Write a protein that binds this ligand. Sequence first.
Ligand SMILES: [Br-]
Ligand SMILES: [Br-]
Ligand SMILES: [Br-]
Ligand SMILES: [Br-]
Ligand SMILES: [Br-]
Ligand SMILES: [Br-]
Ligand SMILES: [Br-]
Ligand SMILES: [Br-]
Ligand SMILES: [Br-]
Ligand SMILES: [Br-]
Ligand SMILES: [Br-]
Ligand SMILES: [Br-]
Ligand SMILES: [Br-]
Lengths: 148, 145
Amino acid sequence: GSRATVFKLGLFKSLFLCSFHDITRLFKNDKTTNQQWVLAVFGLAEVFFEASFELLKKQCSFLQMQKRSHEGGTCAVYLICFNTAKSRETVRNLMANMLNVREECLMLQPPKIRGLSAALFWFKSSLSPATLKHGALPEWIRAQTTLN
Amino acid sequence: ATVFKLGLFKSLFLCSFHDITRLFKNDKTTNQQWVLAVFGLAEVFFEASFELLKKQCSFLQMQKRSHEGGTCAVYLICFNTAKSRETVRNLMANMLNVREECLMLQPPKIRGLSAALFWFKSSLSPATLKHGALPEWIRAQTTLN
Ligand SMILES: [Br-]
Ligand SMILES: [Br-]
Ligand SMILES: [Br-]
Ligand SMILES: [Br-]
Ligand SMILES: [Br-]
Ligand SMILES: [Br-]
Ligand SMILES: [Br-]
Ligand SMILES: [Br-]
Ligand SMILES: [Br-]
Ligand SMILES: [Br-]
Ligand SMILES: [Br-]
Ligand SMILES: [Br-]
Ligand SMILES: [Br-]
């Protein structure tokens, strides 16, 4: 359980300088499946962030990961494109176990696939040397960030 | 390649895997204490396994070494609950992101001075990862009575 709180949203915004709501859309039912997911994780240890990259690569067509932190806390964000569609219930169980964290430490919703500022969040992230990347960029990001 | 695994282990750790373990021929026999050797393991998984095993063990001692011939990590694990080789094999292959053929598992040789001293010597290295109190069979054979 535990979707999110004013405190988790507040920390995300203080670190990434934009709302978690501006890069995702809403799935109110925990059973609806989807290949693409946006994941935010608070209080994650570095060794598990790095191990998750190698493990997700084997079941994904695309993956982009980054992390930030300051005196108030830490937050890692993932754009995941699974080879097979999964529900929030399933992804929640997979990632809490994989990352060695409580479910309350996560926030999960599918991506906002229409909107230029939303597509530029990922394009900007792909320009950092620290970002971990795997696979070909999703067409919805490529199409909105190209043509002049 | 078992003949070559054994050779790599001795080359790196200075003694034979057979001299620090005893034999369990049946993969279903359960036991709390296990000795594990892993070949070709990545560093990030070695470190992550220390944090995950602490959660279900009363004692743990781990080491990892390498050279142009290859890499090997050795573990003395004391689980809270007794487990069979089948069960430990499945657990660790998945935890470490390696094929089961990359592991060697047997219970420890609990009687013999040279075998107890392998663990005592390992505990003196600053590189060794440790958790919990040393097993009584090691403490008793390596202390002046
Ligand atoms: Br969630
Ligand atoms: Br917000
Ligand atoms: Br919506
Ligand atoms: Br829904
Ligand atoms: Br929708
Ligand atoms: Br989508
Ligand atoms: Br935090
Ligand atoms: Br949308
Ligand atoms: Br549409
Ligand atoms: Br909009
Ligand atoms: Br921008
Ligand atoms: Br797409
Ligand atoms: Br074995």
